[PDB]
Amino acid sequence: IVADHVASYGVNLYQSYGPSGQYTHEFDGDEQFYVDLGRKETVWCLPVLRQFRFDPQFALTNIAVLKHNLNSLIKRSNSTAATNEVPEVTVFSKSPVTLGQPNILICLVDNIFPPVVNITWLSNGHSVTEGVSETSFLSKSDHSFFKISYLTLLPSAEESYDCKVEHWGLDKPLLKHWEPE
Amino acid sequence: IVADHVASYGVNLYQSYGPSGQYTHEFDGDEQFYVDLGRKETVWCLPVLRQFRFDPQFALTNIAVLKHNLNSLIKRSNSTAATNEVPEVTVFSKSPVTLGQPNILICLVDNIFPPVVNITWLSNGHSVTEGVSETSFLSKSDHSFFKISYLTLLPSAEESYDCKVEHWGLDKPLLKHWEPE
Amino acid sequence: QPFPQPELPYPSPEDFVYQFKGMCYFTNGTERVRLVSRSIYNREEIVRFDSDVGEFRAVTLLGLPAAEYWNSQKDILERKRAAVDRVCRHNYQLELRTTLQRRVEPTVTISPSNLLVCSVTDFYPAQIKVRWFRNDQEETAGVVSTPLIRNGDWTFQILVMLEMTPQRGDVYTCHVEHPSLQSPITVEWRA
Amino acid sequence: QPFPQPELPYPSPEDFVYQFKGMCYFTNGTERVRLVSRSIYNREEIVRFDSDVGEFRAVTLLGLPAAEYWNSQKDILERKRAAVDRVCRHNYQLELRTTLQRRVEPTVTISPSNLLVCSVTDFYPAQIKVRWFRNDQEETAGVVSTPLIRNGDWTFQILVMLEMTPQRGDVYTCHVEHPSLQSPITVEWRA
Numbered sequence A, B: 001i002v003a004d005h006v007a008s009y010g011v012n013l014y015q016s017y018g019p020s021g022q023y024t025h026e027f028d029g030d031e032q033f034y035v036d037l038g039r040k041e042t043v044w045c046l047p048v049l050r051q052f053r054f055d056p057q058f059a060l061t062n063i064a065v066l067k068h069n070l071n072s073l074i075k076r077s078n079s080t081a082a083t084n085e086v087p088e089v090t091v092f093s094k095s096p097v098t099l100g101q102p103n104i105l106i107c108l109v110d111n112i113f114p115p116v117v118n119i120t121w122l123s124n125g126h127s128v129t130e131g132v133s134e135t136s137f138l139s140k141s142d143h144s145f146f147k148i149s150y151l152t153l154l155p156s157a158e159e160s161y162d163c164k165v166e167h168w169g170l171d172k173p174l175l176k177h178w179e180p181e
Numbered sequence C, D: 001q002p003f004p005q006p007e008l009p010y011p012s013p014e015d016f017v018y019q020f021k022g023m024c025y026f027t028n029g030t031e032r033v034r035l036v037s038r039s040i041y042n043r044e045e046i047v048r049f050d051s052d053v054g055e056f057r058a059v060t061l062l063g064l065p066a067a068e069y070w071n072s073q074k075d076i077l078e079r080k081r082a083a084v085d086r087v088c089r090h091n092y093q094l095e096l097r098t099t100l101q102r103r104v105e106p107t108v109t110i111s112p113s114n115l116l117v118c119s120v121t122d123f124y125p126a127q128i129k130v131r132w133f134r135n136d137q138e139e140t141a142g143v144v145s146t147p148l149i150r151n152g153d154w155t156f157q158i159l160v161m162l163e164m165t166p167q168r169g170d171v172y173t174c175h176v177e178h179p180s181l182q183s184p185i186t187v188e189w190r191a
C-alpha cells in the first residue's frame, strides 16, 4: 500500500510464551508511545506528544480481547505454532566517530519472529550493564518485527564492542562486532 | 518497481558450494528456459518457445564472468558468507481432487537462500522417483529464490504423500503432508 | 487525545553467492521500457545499471570499484545505453508472438467441503475475477479467496470459498471472468 | 532468438502469537484516507476491515467465523465504517500539530575513510537530498549512498561516500537540502 503517511493506532500484540503483551502507536515507522501493561501507564517516546493524554486502560482492555482471540485460534488452527525466523543484525553508530566524544551504538535486529529476543552488549568481550536501552517491538508489513537497542559509549582506541542477540531462530547467540577504527 | 510486465534476460547464478551455476530467462515470474551447463544445451520450459534458438555458450561464458567476479568479492568482503534462511513449504494439488482422475501434487519451497535445497517426495513412507519433476531456482526481488517440485499421482483413499525439504536453514528435514480427503 | 482502534472478540557448508539479473520492465507495450541490470553479492545488490539514470551506480561500497571501472569504459557505456532496444524491446517482439499470446481458459469446479469451494484452475494469464452467488444475490461477507497461486508450469489457480447452509431449491453460482473467455464462465451448485 | 544481457568482469519453546493493527493510510493530508484493521494469527492475516470495501473480509479460512459474526452485527459495522473519520482523520489533526511539525536540522560532517564520507545525521523528517561536488561539477558516478537509516529515536541519518583523487586547489563540497533548512547546508573539504 502506497501512502504519504502510514500510522498504526495501534499495534496490539499478545503471545502465549510468558505470556506477554505489547501495546504501541506508530507513525511513519517510529514508536509514538507504549503502554506499560504492568504499571498501567502511557510512556511517550516523543517529548512533544506528552501534551496529550492516552487512557492506558484501553490497552489493557484491548490486549485482554487479544488473549481471548488467541485461545480460540490456537484450538481452531489445530495448535499451529509460530515459525522461528532468522533475525538480521546490524550495528552502527548514531553519529560519526570522534575519539573522546560521547556517542551511541545502535543495534538493529530485523526480521524478528516470534517477538521474543534478548539483545545485550559486550565491551572488550564482557557484558555491559550501564547505558543500555531499547525500543519496543516495531511492526513490519510482513507481520514480523524489528527492535533497536542502544549503547552509550566513549569511542577510544582500546574499547571494541559486540551486539549479542539471542533468538530461537539462532542455534548460537549472534555477535555483531563494531570497532571505532 | 511497477510495470505491466517484468522479465529477466536472464537470471545468472553462481555459488562457491559445488561449485554450481544456473542460467535461466524469466517472463512475468515464470521460467522460459534454462541452459544445462553440463550438457551445453538450452531446455525450453514452454512448448511455444521451442521455435527459438538460444546459444548455450552465452550462459557458459556469462557464468565464467560470475565466477571471476565472485572470487574478487569473496576477498574484498573479507569472506562474508551467505546467511541460511528458513524456507517456507506449501503443498497443494494442481487440480481439485477427484478420485481416479490424474492429478499433480505441487510442493512450493519459498524463501530459499542460499539456493541449495533437496526436495523429495514420499508415498506411504517410501521415496517416489517416477512422475517427479521440478523447476529451476526462480528469482525473487529480495534476491532469495523459490523452487517448485511436482509429483504426478492418481488420487486414491489409501494413498497419502509428503514433500520432504532439506535445507541448511532447517535443523531437521521439513515434511509437509498431503491427503486426498 | 489520540483515538485508537479496538479489537473485537472472536466468536554446514560455507556458501558465497553471486547473482546477475538482466531485467526489463515494460509498460504500455514497448512505449515505456526500463532496463535494470543488477549485480548481487549474496543478497546485497552492490552495483546496477538503470537505463533511467544512464550510467553504472554502486548500490553499496562493495560495488564502487566495479561501478567506477565500468563507467570509465565509454564503449561499455554506449552499448549499455543501447540495451533497452537491443535486449528489452527486441525480446518483447518475441514475447508478443509467444508468451503474450498465451491464452489458457480456466477450469471451474465446485465441490462441498457447509463450505463451498470454487476452484478456478489452470489458467493464463494472471488476470481473473471470481464471484459467488446464493440464488441471484452476490455473497461477499462469507467469502474467503486465496491469493493468486502460481503453479510454476505457466498456469495459475485460485480458490474462492463460501460459507453456506444448504437448503432445497437454493442455487449457488460461481462466476469467473478471464481474458481468454468470450463470455464469463458460470457453474451452478444445488443441494 | 532472445538477446541476453552480459555481466561484466570486476576490476525451542512453543509460541502462539496474535496481532491486531489499527492502521491508517494518509495521502494528500486528509483528502485521501484509508483505514485497514488487521487481525493476524502468528504471521498470517486472517481477517481485515478495509474502509475501501466497507465490511469485514476473511483473508484466510481461519478468519471466516470472525468475519461472519462481526458482519452480522450492523451496529459493529456502522462504527467500523465511521472509524476512518473518528480515528484516522481525527488523529491526523494531532499529527499535524506534533509529528508533522517536527523539524530537526541535520548535522553534516565530512571525514576521510581516497574516499570521502559525508555524514548527514540526526535529522527529521525523512525527506533529504545530498549531493557531492568537486569544485563546480556534481559528482555522481563515483558516489555511493547508504539507504535512509532509521535510528529509532525519531531521527534519521544517511551516509554519502565519494571516491576522489585530490589535486592541489581542489575543493570538495557536500550539499544537503532538508525541509528544516532555510538554505541548504554546504560543508567543504580540503586536503
Ligand SMILES: *[C@@H]1O[C@H](CO)[C@@H](O)[C@H](O)[C@H]1NC(C)=O
Binding pocket: A116, A117, A118, A166, A167, A168
Ligand atoms: C533470554 O534470557 C533468559 C535469561 O538469561 C533466558 O532464560 C531466555 O531463554 C533467553 N531468551 C532467548 C530467546 O534466548
